[PDB]
Every structure is written in C-alpha cells, then in structure tokens.
C-alpha cells in the first residue's frame, strides 16, 4: 500500500509503496490471538513448586496406633489435612511454551503489520540516524513525528546510537528488522520503520 515517507525532521519526502503480500493482507484476527497467547506463554518462567507429602521434612512414623485411642486414624504428621502437611497437586516447575506452524507465524506478523497500515500507525522514515547517542534528540524526533504514546522503532541492522537514545524513553522500543514480532508490534501504538528495514522485512516475509 501507498504510505507517506518522512524524514527525521518530520517533513514528507513523497510516498513509498509497501508490498501488499506483507502490508496489505486481510488481517487474520484468530491467528493474531493465537500468536499473542503463544508469545505470552513463552515468556513465563514457570519456576514454582510446592512440597508434596514425600518432600516435607519428617513425617515417617504413624502418629498413633490405628485402633483404640478414639482418634481419627492418621498415617503421617505431614499428610495433607495436617497443618504443616504436604500440598496435594500444587504447582510444579514446567514450561508453557508451544510452537504454532511456521506459516501461522508468517500470517500473524503480516496480520499485525497490515493492521498498522489500516489504522494509519505506520511511519516509514527515509532513514533514522543520530549524530550523538543523545536521548534528548530521540525525544525531539518523536515529537516531530507526532509520536505521543508508545512506539516501536525498527532499523535494518543494529543502530547503536538509536538503540541508546531511545533506551530510557518509556514505551519506546528499538529493534532490528529480524527482531520484529507480534507482541512488540501490537503493544506499541506507532510503528516507526526505516525504508531500509521495510525492504528487509519484505525480503523475509514476502
């Protein structure tokens, strides 16, 4: 699709034609849901455990004889109904990761990119280039592009100065073209992407 091309300073240098196979598909909402859920599950560390009745300290002996005392029969002071007892079926360390088919992954990232173009929240830049790695300059650039809220900045390769300048601004994330991903795209209002990065994204996804 046809989109305005901008400079850093915020002046429009004509238009650029984004590949329709990437930026012009009908977004598959069910696929994007699945990709978001899958990606958030991948982030979980899953480090959680309880002690069952075997793992709690002590508890070997029968607390009192089976018959004759008038008490309920009990097998261990760490049986699960005892205060201080083992837990029945609590958490155990585990992974929550699973893989979607590679074609579903392709669809999902195309969907959210193509949805950014519909919502007019893509900003293609001629190039993005800071003289000094200075946060004040990045903040000025984002002001100029009318980037009020959160934004994902996508460069073709690692750009140390852009990375460093945006690092400390809240809700701005810098990423290489390789590093683009569904959750980062959907969780930033504006997508600032360089023309070099657009070409690099198209290369892979188309």
């Amino acid at each position: 699709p046809k989109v305005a091309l901008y400079n850093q300073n915020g002046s429009t240098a004509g238009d650029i034609e984004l590949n329709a196979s990437v930026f012009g598909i009908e977004p598959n909402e069910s696929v994007v849901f699945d990709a978001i859920l899958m990606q958030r599950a991948s982030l979980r560390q899953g480090t959680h455990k309880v002690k069952n009745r075997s793992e709690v300290r002590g508890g070997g002996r029968k607390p009192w004889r089976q018959k004759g005392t008038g008490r309920a029969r009990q097998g261990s002071i760490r049986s699960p109904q005892w205060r201080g007892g083992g837990v029945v079926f609590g958490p155990t360390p585990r992974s929550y990761s699973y893989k979607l088919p590679k074609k579903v992954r392709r669809l999902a990232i195309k969907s959210v990119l193509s949805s950014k173009v519909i919502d007019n929240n893509i900003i293609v830049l001629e190039d993005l280039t800071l003289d000094t790695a200075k946060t004040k300059e990045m903040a000025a650039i984002l002001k100029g592009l009318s980037v009020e809220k959160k934004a994902l900045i996508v460069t073709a390769d690692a750009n140390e100065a852009v990375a460093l300048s945006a690092r400390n601004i809240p809700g701005v994330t810098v990423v290489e073209a390789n590093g683009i991903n569904v959750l980062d795209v959907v969780n930033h209002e504006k997508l600032l992407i360089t023309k070099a990065a657009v070409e690099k994204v198209e290369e892979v996804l188309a």
Binding site: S30, V32, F33, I36
Partner: protein, 146 residues
C-alpha cells in the same frame, strides 16, 4: 488486534470441568464416579482389555504369521501424480523426492496404474505395475527400470 480487546475464535476454547466442587455443578460429592466399587477408587479401575477374569479376547485367539527382516516397502506413485510433470520430462526418484511428489523413498519408487496419464514422460523407477508400464508406453513415453 488490541491487547485490551483480545477475543478467541468462537468454539476454540472451552472451560474445563472441575469435579467435586459442590452439588449445583452436577459433579459434586462423588465427582461423577457413582457409588463405591473399584471404578470409584483413587488409582482405581482394571487394566485395559481385562474382562474381570474371563479369558481376554486376545488370549482366546491365535497368534498369526511372522515379520520378514528383508521386507521391502516401495514409495508408490500413481499415474495421476505423473500427470503433474511437464511433457517430455525425465521423471526419476530424485526428482519425485525433490519436487515433493514423494516424502520418503524407502526401498524405491514403484509406479502404479491408478488414474490416467496424458503426458509423454521418460519415467525411471525401481518397479512398475503391469498396468502402469503399459499406460506410460501407451502415452508415448518410456518405462525404464533403474
């Protein structure tokens, strides 16, 4: 999508049933297991195929046959699949495998005679059905064994 307005595909996700959580649910108390007996017990139930001591079906019936060490399975290709190639193509196992017409070679390609072949082809395969050889030669082509 927006992370604040996520919505699963209708019919993609159901709520799990949680038994033994009160009478209103319809699986309170006995948790759907009925009353007593081996099937209601924790860890309970007889092993698969057990018939409570009646001689199990598998044990009533005789073992049959043997397995050949040297069994050959061929990747079979019917004539309809050869129809997808270009005219005058030298169809080989390596091409079939590369194009994705077959997934695994196994003992070799065998050509079988299901469907119709219009296109003339030089088919090189390990085996042919009598039908398939005839059908390849009838279309003008060649059925070389390799």
């Amino acid at each position: 999508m927006k992370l604040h307005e996520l919505k699963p595909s209708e019919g993609s996700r159901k709520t799990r049933n949680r038994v033994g959580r009160g009478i209103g649910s319809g699986n309170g108390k006995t948790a759907g297991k009925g009353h007593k007996g081996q099937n209601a017990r924790s860890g309970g139930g007889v092993r698969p195929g057990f018939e409570g001591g009646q001689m199990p079906l598998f044990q009533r019936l005789p073992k049959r046959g043997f397995t050949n060490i040297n069994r050959k399975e061929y990747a079979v290709v019917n004539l309809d699949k050869l129809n997808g190639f270009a005219e005058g193509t030298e169809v080989t196992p390596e091409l079939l495998l590369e194009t994705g017409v077959i997934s695994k070679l196994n003992a070799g390609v065998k050509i079988l005679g299901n469907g119709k072949l219009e296109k003339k082809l030089t088919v090189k395969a390990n085996k042919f059905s009598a039908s398939a050889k005839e059908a390849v030669e009838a279309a003008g082509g060649t059925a070389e064994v390799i």
